[PDB]
Amino acid sequence: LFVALYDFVASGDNTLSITKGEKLRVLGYNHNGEWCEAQTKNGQGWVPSNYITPVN
């Protein structure tokens, strides 16, 4: 379980918009770990790995 640290606006290419304080489930990462594939209430798609952090 993760929480979003900052807003991120989707730039297409299967990226997902997230809002600060939103909850996220993490499915995995790309090859260099810079991108994270996540699921939120709004869908599923890629977000920056350091825009999120574990919670609990």
Partner: peptide
């Protein structure tokens, strides 16, 4: 996953 790198954190 996007081939570009993501924005740096604010």
């Amino acid at each position: 996953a996007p081939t570009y790198s993501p924005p740096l954190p604010p």
